[PDB]
Design a protein around this nucleic acid. Sequence first.
DNA 1: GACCACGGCCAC
DNA 2: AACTGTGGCCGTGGTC
Length: 539
Amino acid sequence: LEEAPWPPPEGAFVGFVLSRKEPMWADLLALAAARGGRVHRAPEPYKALRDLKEARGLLAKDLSVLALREGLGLPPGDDPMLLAYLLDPSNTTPEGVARRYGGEWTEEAGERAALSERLFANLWGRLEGEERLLWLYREVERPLSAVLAHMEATGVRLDVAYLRALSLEVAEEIARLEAEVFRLAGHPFNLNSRDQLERVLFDELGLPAIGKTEKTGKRSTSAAVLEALREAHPIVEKILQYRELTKLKSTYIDPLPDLIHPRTGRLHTRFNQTATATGRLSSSDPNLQNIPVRTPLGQRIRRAFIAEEGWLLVALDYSQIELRVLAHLSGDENLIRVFQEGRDIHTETASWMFGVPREAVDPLMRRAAKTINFGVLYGMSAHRLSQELAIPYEEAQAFIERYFQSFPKVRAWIEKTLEEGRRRGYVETLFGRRRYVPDLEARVKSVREAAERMAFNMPVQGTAADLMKLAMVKLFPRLEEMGARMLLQVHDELVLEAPKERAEAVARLAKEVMEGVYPLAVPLEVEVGIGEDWLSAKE
DNA sequence: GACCACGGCCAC
DNA sequence: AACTGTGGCCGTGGTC
Ligand SMILES: Nc1ncnc2c1c(C#CCNC(=O)COCCO)cn2[C@H]1C[C@H](O)[C@@H](COP(=O)(O)OP(=O)(O)OP(=O)(O)O)O1
Ligand SMILES: [Mg+2]
Ligand SMILES: [Mg+2]
Ligand SMILES: [Mn+2]
């Protein structure tokens, strides 16, 4: 292109180079812009940001986050990645997109600006006529990128000293467990090495091997295997407690305090918008979509996520979301009725599983029902179900027969979805988000049946993900007008931060927005809670 | 140091 | 184990 001087005319496509992938931690090494056959390279990239009215180009949200970090309101606009991601959600990285639609992703801001321009022209062209995908782009993904940029730049407060103290406590408990494991093994070894543990359990000790690993065919030491060996030897019980504690310590307790941002004093994740095959978001660096909650220790970790002084956290979580979506997508009269009568299937399966009435179901029991209810729905085998619930085989088969007869039109929808996917090569959500599944006609059974379970899962999970994204787009402006903040999204959950005096009003309004985002044949119920910490806010 | 595959495991 | 699905991060063991 013809190199022209900075600044660029309005509407130009930006290219930028970061010192590291995390925009909140990155140094802006270079900045450029392309438009009208010209390329504009900025002398000083930081001051050159102030000249742009919009981040338009590849990975636009990342540059918008860095601008917010510097106190600049530079919103993200068009991004070829979002167009490619809607065309085919396997388009997840700029390296692939560039190769597939006419360019090369280099490490130079100018070339990245020119690439953004060329890729947008070609991808925008491939989308004309795909009115449903364009609707998703204009009404969901492009507006959503702006919401996510603000979430990423805002961050969440964390009780550092609390986790620091917790680490020392867990460390002492880990030493007690590993000391008994070594004694029981007769000698010490690296208990973190599953290869070394394999020998101790199955070679030195006489324990039987329950299963093999996928890629290398070693004797597995997974929780499901150790759980099956729980009575075969006392050492097994302690290895499971050792695994729980080292998992939480090495993944959450120790790394998270070291990630507080020096300017903000808060913890900043990244919400990746083109990372999943179903339309869900993902979270990384750090992932805040898998903070513990199951075990008592996991709850102590979740308590570390707190509200700023004078504020409160507001947590909103859709009820039985993918089951409600299934009712709407399938049209099953019976399942619709279940939610019109305010029934809760997780609680019901839980009572069934545990031989305990609804009133006596605790939060932990209900969680176990989710694996069952969603396991069965998405193709779980009778054999495994029997093994998970520790009950005979015929009983497990009976649960699955009862499950689907209760809602006959589900299997009809599954079959229509698969037949539709074989003819067109893709399945779609309620809004037209597509996932290509070419293995539906594979002539290897395992490969084909795997494709089938991914295929008919995507419309359900992806529709729920669509609803949440749309709700986030509608809610964000209402929160700014109330002086509240959107902090985290966990698939079907939102965590907000609100001034104490407006916390209750924010909770009400956020609940209404999420429930009336897009009415279905069943009502969307949202559970909401308020508290000083994340755990308190979901009760 | 930077990768990588793998087994394993946290969440939805 | 996996013959529910969607993710990302850990330590180990290995290569460069
Ligand atoms: N196992 C799954 N397989 C496939 N899909 C799944 C799950 C799963 C789970 C789980 C917990 N168990 C484990 O992680 C394993 O450990 C077992 C050891 O015992 C969630 N989803 C999907 C569908 C769901 O509607 C959506 C949001 O989730 P989530 O707000 O919590 O539920 P929900 O909205 O329905 O229900 P509530 O809000 O509580 O009303 O995510
Ligand atoms: Mg949830
Ligand atoms: Mg892996
Ligand atoms: Mn939910």
